[PDB]
Design a protein around this ligand. Structure first.
Ligand SMILES: Cc1cc2nc3c(=O)[nH]c(=O)nc-3n(C[C@H](O)[C@H](O)[C@H](O)COP(=O)(O)O)c2cc1C
Ligand SMILES: Cc1cc2nc3c(=O)[nH]c(=O)nc-3n(C[C@H](O)[C@H](O)[C@H](O)COP(=O)(O)O)c2cc1C
Lengths: 212, 212
């Protein structure tokens, strides 16, 4: 708890100049994610996902980043959830990594596309057994009349699955968010943040500094 | 750093039952905000604000909560920023308090309205002198060709204001987000979160538990 405090002070010694930026924004994201992990932030892979309903109202919630590469950033969710309904009507989403403990933010803008069954199955059968079970329990985002509904169904499903592999719910899936824009924010001198926007354009990245 | 660790363990000993909920959601928000402050989270008042552009694309960034009451939650920003432009075309916003260090989230849905000059002036002239200056420096969200633009203007404005009260920029203002919905999330038993939605309806709050 002094080792962690020290690491956070070192990773917060930030300037951020254009000439030190990598060509691929995911190189910088990888570096900051590794620092969030080493500094033991709570849930370093946690990201706030924003979606928009049919009335133009934005909604937000935290999800975990499970995978990223050039094709985008992946999370898993219940396909009957509010976020899945909103994505089906409007695939435009924003992701924000709230790394303000290290004076950082990352924001990703892109379109969410569903994962295939093969991808979902691979991830599901990597989860701890008790995570597989919980995925069955909850009709995510529906009104429920009592907490006991969850607790009862959890007990029943434990009993039902006890002596086999936990099957994949038909209602569990995932989304990959394309990399149209990636924005980096790092606290800077005189409380003037360094801010860079990577914009995907003509199979390349256009980088601009933004005023904070 | 053992005192903080202990406080975080105590405030994370959560069950959340309907019968223990306050009538006014801001009573529970006040309690969780006070706990985030006592546990020394980074920026306990930090909230992620989501807005939507004219194409239906959501955007996100962190701002600080400055004030809250029944009329809504207040933040300050530069009126030429992307968020201010997006609000002018679509006043629907979401706020999320990323308190996952204490296994919590709070989300607020409502409409953003501008603050009056008298309100903006009162807050501006409470800021530290060096905060007043910085508010002049940056054409928030515009592309800038170099970091030095910020550093130069900061030095010039320091010199210009040295021996007087720092005047209020015409381009600095704020927004109050109405309380249409407030949602509380707290990590729960068997990794099944307690989730409650307060929905404003007929001059009252309708509370429902949501499945996690
Ligand atoms: C740290 C943390 C991680 C979470 N990870 C996920 C996740 O990966 N997927 C998911 O569906 N919900 C996750 N949740 C729950 C969501 O925030 C949200 O409550 C749920 O997905 C329902 O969102 P919706 O009603 O807007 O669709 C997480 C919550 C927290 C606090
Ligand atoms: C902890 C923290 C607090 C911040 N507080 C504010 C704020 O209160 N107001 C503000 O305009 N920007 C604030 N920012 C900067 C915003 O996240 C964002 O970079 C800026 O407002 C531009 O957003 P826009 O280009 O989307 O309009 C904060 C950033 C962090 C990391």
């Amino acid at each position: 708890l002094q080792q962690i405090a020290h690491l956070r002070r070192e990773y917060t010694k930030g300037g951020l100049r254009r000439r030190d930026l990598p060509a691929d924004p995911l190189t910088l994201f990888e570096r900051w994610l590794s620092q969030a992990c080493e500094a033991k932030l709570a849930d370093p892979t946690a990201m706030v996902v924003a979606t928009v309903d049919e009335h133009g109202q934005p909604y937000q919630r935290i999800v975990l980043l499970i995978h990223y590469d050039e094709k985008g950033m992946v999370f898993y969710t219940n396909l009957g959830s509010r976020k899945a309904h909103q994505i089906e009507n409007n695939p435009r989403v924003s992701l924000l990594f709230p790394w303000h403990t290290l004076e950082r933010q990352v924001m990703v803008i892109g379109k969410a596309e569903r994962l295939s069954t093969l991808e979902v199955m691979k991830f599901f059968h990597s989860l701890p057994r008790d995570s597989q079970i919980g995925a069955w329990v909850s009709k995510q985002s529906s009104r429920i009349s009592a907490r006991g509904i969850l607790e009862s169904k959890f007990l029943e499903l434990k009993q039902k699955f006890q002596q086999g592999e936990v099957p994949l719910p038909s209602f569990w899936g995932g989304f990959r968010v394309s990399l149209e824009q990636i924005e980096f924010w790092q606290g800077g001198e005189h409380r003037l943040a360094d801010r860079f926007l990577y914009q995907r354009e003509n199979d390349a990245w256009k980088i601009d500094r933004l005023a904070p």
